[PDB]
């Protein structure tokens, strides 16, 4: 499987960082303070592709930790999941780990492959967790830019 290191920033220029072992938060970050920003390993996995939709998995670079989801109390929920550091990543990743990377005018959206029309979302306010939101439209942020890193 092919991968790619990158950071994500919401359309509001918020950066993502590790809250506890298993949460991500979004905050406005500038300066050498930028160092505390999470670098993903974005893997191109197997799934349904279009010129516009590309299935990926999103792990933390050098951690055996992956964004997935779970129904938690009858709702789709974003979580960080530990995996066997020897089996991952794979081309044929389990569905819970798969997002459709959607290009939409220089911006990206990350839709759950598992829950159609649920997106990786951040909040308008500082220091709130990154979550899975089912609504696009003036409120929560569902769009990101991506920066390559080495």
Task: Find the CATH number of the domain harbouring 98.
Answer: 2.80.10.50
CA 76 to each of CA 21, 47, 112, 113: distance values in angstroms, whole numbers, following the listed order: 20, 20, 9, 12
- Contacts of 35 by beta carbon, 8 Å cutoff, 6+ apart: none
Q: What span, in angstroms and rounded, lies between the C-alpha atoms of 23 and 2?
A: 25
CA 127 distance to own-chain centroid = 16
DSSP track, the chain? -B--EEEEEETT--EEEE-STT-EEEE---SGGGGGPPPEEEEE-SS---SSEEEEEEEETTSSEEEEEEESSSSEEEEEEE--TTT-S-SS--GGGEEEEEEETTEEEEEESSSTT-EEEB-SSTTEEPEEES--SSSSB--EEEEE--
Q: Residue 134 has which token pair?
A: 């089912």
Nearest to 113 by CA among 25, 52, 54: 54
Domains held by the chain: number: 1
Range of the domain at 97: 1-150
Q: Are strands 24-27 and 65-71 parallel, antiparallel or unpaired?
A: unpaired
């Amino acid at each position: 499987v092919r991968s790619l290191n990158a950071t994500l920033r919401d359309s509001q220029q918020k950066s993502l960082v590790m809250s506890g072992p298993y949460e991500l938060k979004a905050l406005h970050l500038q300066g050498q303070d930028m160092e505390q920003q999470v670098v993903f390993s974005m893997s191109f996995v197997q799934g349904e592709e279009s010129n516009d939709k590309i299935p990926v998995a999103l792990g933390l670079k050098e951690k055996n930790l992956y964004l997935s989801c779970v129904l938690k109390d009858d709702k789709p929920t974003l979580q960080l999941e530990s995996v066997d550091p020897k089996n991952y990543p794979k081309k044929k990743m389990e569905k819970r780990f798969v997002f459709n990377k959607i290009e939409i005018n220089n911006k990206l959206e990350f839709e759950s492959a598992q829950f159609p029309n649920w997106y990786i979302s951040t909040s308008q306010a500082e220091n709130m967790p990154v979550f899975l939101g089912g609504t696009k439209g003036g409120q929560d942020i569902t769009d990101f830019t991506m920066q390559f890193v080495s």
